[PDB]
Amino acid sequence: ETWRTNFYYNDVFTWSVADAPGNILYTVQHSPQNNPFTAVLSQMYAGWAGGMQFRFIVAGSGVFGGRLVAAVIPPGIEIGPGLEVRQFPHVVIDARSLEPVTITMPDLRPNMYHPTGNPGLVPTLVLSVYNNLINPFGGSTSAIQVTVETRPSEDFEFVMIRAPSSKT
Amino acid sequence: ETWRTNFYYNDVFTWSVADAPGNILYTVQHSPQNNPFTAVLSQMYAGWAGGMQFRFIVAGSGVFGGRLVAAVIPPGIEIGPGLEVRQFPHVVIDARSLEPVTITMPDLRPNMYHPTGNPGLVPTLVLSVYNNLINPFGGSTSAIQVTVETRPSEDFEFVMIRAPSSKT
Amino acid sequence: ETWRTNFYYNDVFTWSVADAPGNILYTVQHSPQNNPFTAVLSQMYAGWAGGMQFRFIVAGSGVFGGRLVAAVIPPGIEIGPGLEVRQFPHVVIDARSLEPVTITMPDLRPNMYHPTGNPGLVPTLVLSVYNNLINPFGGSTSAIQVTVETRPSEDFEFVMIRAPSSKT
Amino acid sequence: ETWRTNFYYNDVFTWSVADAPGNILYTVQHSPQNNPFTAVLSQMYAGWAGGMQFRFIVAGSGVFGGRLVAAVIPPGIEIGPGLEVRQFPHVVIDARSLEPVTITMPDLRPNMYHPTGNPGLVPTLVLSVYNNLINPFGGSTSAIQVTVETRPSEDFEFVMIRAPSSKT
Amino acid sequence: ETWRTNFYYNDVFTWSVADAPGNILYTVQHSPQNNPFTAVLSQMYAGWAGGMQFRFIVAGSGVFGGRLVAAVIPPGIEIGPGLEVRQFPHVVIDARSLEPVTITMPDLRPNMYHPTGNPGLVPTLVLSVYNNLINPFGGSTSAIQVTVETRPSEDFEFVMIRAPSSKT
Amino acid sequence: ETWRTNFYYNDVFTWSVADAPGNILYTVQHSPQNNPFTAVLSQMYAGWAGGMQFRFIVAGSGVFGGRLVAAVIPPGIEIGPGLEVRQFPHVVIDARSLEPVTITMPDLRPNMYHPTGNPGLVPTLVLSVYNNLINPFGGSTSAIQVTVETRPSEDFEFVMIRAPSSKT
């Protein structure tokens, strides 16, 4: 299936020099709505399970400095300013990265599947500043953009086909 | 075990000529209480899992016309007048059927087992009119009866034996 | 895939005693729009190919008489009153049929695939009266209903995945 | 060849309650003209041999009674009112038959092949009343229709290709 | 054949800082005219089929930032400002890329071959801005050049040799 | 065990242009307290042995210059300004390094294990300037940050389980 072999655009956010280390820049809950094609397919099924892959593309240059840290937070843990992302299993993203950086969010769940419309407890992916962005030139450029892309994992699947006009 | 090899009477409902297509005639939630012998056994166990088979016997004649449609609704979907039963996986029941028609309701659940007294989310079986009943003679007979019978499926089982006098 | 293993409701039409033999009661062009689930999937693909199966359920009784004839018309043949359906390859449908009657419409096409939004030349399925309906009782019932259901064939497939928001 | 794998419409006749037992309702001589597609092919050949299959579709209902008898008459036997069809090899056709009844007419001939335009001696298929039609309701319906279809047998063939514009 | 083993110059376009994300910078229809040597060979043949490879060489530097996205659009889809290139299968091109980036455009066609002079429906390759170009120095340089090169794919071929002086 | 398969944050220090070559920037003694998860586990054991891996992430840019040198100092050697780090076995760390640099500190000890609370003689890891940091632009940026991460080695282990409320 071609809809699960390629990465597709999901979202975009901004990283600036003002952001102090430890600040959270981007959070998203695990859901089929985070992919363009799973959102279409979800209207004819009553449940889902499996993980998803995320890919980050940094639109920086070779003169910038600074790093970001991304990690997956298990269900049942409060998300806020006092979260130590750097002490979870994580990956490191550079400002002058030329190749995309990929992190997989597995389906960490206490149930067997997520009902559509009420998935229950789900994991969360959190992006935060590890080292603050620096611009040695000090000109008019004080921020850069990061693009997010997603692709379903190998074990992702739908269950319990249903009528398209039904209500969850 | 003879208590799980034969079909036994569960309920009965009425089908008339006045019922317009799409009207729901009979609904039942998945439960051990839908069989005479599982209801007795349920008083000494604390949990259950597995499916059940349903059998419909139509007390019609060779001059009637009209059809019914039966389907299993997954947990988490609202049941009401605006439910498109004909666009779920279903079976078709005729008014002049001589042989019984059998549909199996599997145990579609997000948990590992159903606690007794609080099973949680369960599937539902829905019977509705597919084509309205017709009587070409137009006499005094305007309704017929349908008998419902049940038998536990192969994978049905009880767990966690408990004292008979305990309270759930 | 459960969306291609079961039959689902498509349409319904009326057959009465007034219809003279040779009259056409129901026609439909070959298209993914004739199935509830292929219509949803067609919004993310740019082409399709393959056949479809049709199933007819007659809501008659044991006292009616009369027969219908159904056939597949190859592309490039005019459809109208002067069409001899009975001299094409066809199937015969009875008024008192208890079991559904199934006919397969293959993908007869001069191209390699059908572009979505402009399929080109396609076959057509035609239903017409073979012997007129008769009611020996002669009461108030002069018409019966026929339900149509569809299921994709084994060789049906989609090609050329595309963005859901694109325009054909 | 698709022209010899399917049944096609040939003719139709009427069966009523007035017809006394032993009356002949339908007769036809063995000929390539009894099939739509052999009639077209016969214009480029000078001879033919082989049998043909006949199929009868009764447009009755479940309340009618009565039976018909069909048999093949060898060449050289006079056909008329004093013909005992019931004492030839025969098949029995019911008024409330749901499935078509098939009889094969073999090529019983004293020659090697039939010249086109002068076949010589040929067999004949005869339909007659075995038990008279009865309508217990006694309303306005006193007759039913029977449709005839044909398909060439396995051993049917043409010989001696000729110019289409020649005269036999 | 050396004419199908090496890349050769096709075209060039301009990328500037003013271009907003989503703007289309370069489009080309699939054709033998996009390669220097297939254009010469096309004057003695009446048809062609097969894909082509494209190669992009960015004349940027190590201080620029920004990315482009390239994708193949199937035949029968409207090309314009409201095209979501980022949600097709695509490749990502960087402003400071040192190595060339290659994308293959297959021959997506509903026919068997493309007649020369009237190929019919053909795919299209589209280049658009994914992240806008940025120059941290902010001097006089506000645009860069991108060179395009092509090479026929393995399955490309010509058919139906014809006189060089004939007219299509 | 996931607590010994991933790197986790330990500390951070500052590197500036003012630091002359040979100056020491960061020193740490070998201890279970240098990892977040070994510090928790150390409260229920009475001894430990084995090495630890260190990882350095430099938050520099592509325009900076300068290098650092890191080495492991055996127990029993005085640590001070007159230490020739460059003439020990060492690794070299660059200011514009994109990938992390890893050095392993083995458990060089004259005993069999380190008692908790009084480990005895232990090795030390020393970071010092090899070539001074340079900023060709000469703007307001005169310092960069270096992040330190740790992960236990393969041969690290605890011994002699003890009551959590005991005192060493």
Describe the overall structure.
Chains A, B, C, D, E, F: Keywords: Host cytoplasm, Virion. Chains A, B, C, D, E, F: It comes from Rabbit hemorrhagic disease virus 2. Chains A, B, C, D, E, F: This is Capsid protein. Chain A is mainly beta and 168 residues long. The two termini of chain A are 27 Å apart. Chain A contains 1 helix and 11 strands, in the order ββαβββββββββ. Helix content of chain A is 4%, strand content 44%. Chains in contact: A-B, A-C, A-E, A-F, B-C, C-D, C-E. At the A-B interface, strand 8 of A face loops of B.
How do you describe this structure in short?
The PDB classes it as virus like particle. The structure is cut from a larger assembly and holds six copies of chain A (168 residues). Chain A is mainly beta and 168 residues long.
List the helices and strands and how they pair.
The structure is cut from a larger assembly and holds six copies of chain A (168 residues).
Chain A: E1 8-16, E2 24-29, H1 36-41, E3 45-49, E4 52-58, E5 65-73, E6 90-94, E7 101-105, E8 114-115, E9 124-134, E10 143-152, E11 157-161
Antiparallel strand pairs in A: 1-10, 2-9, 3-8, 3-11, 4-7, 4-10, 5-6, 5-9
